[PDB]
Amino acid sequence: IREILKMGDERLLRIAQPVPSELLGSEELQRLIDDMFETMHHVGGVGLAAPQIGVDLQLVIFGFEPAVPPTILLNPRITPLDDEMEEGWEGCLSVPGLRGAVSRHRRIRYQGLDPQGQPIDRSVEGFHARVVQHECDHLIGRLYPSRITDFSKFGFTEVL
Catalytic positions are: 135
Q: Which residue number, 14 or 82, has a Cβ lying nearer to Ni ion? A: 14
For the CB of residue 106, give the shortest distance to Ni ion in the complex, in Å. 19
Residue 121, phi-psi category: left (phi > 0), alpha (psi -120 to 50), beta (remainder)? beta
Q: Which residue number, 20 or 54, has a Cβ lying nearer to Ni ion? A: 20
Is beta strand 119-125 parallel, antiparallel or unpaired with respect to 98-105? unpaired
10-39 positions binding Ni ion, by CB under 5 A: 20
For the CB of residue 91, give the shortest distance to Ni ion in the complex, in Å. 8
Q: Which residue number, 20 or 69, has a Cβ lying nearer to Ni ion? A: 20
The closest alpha carbon to 19, from 85, 88, 72, belongs to 72
Q: What whole-number distance in Å separates Cα of residue 145 and Cα of residue 105?
A: 16
Among 50, 92, 101, 129, binds Ni ion (CB under 5 A): 92
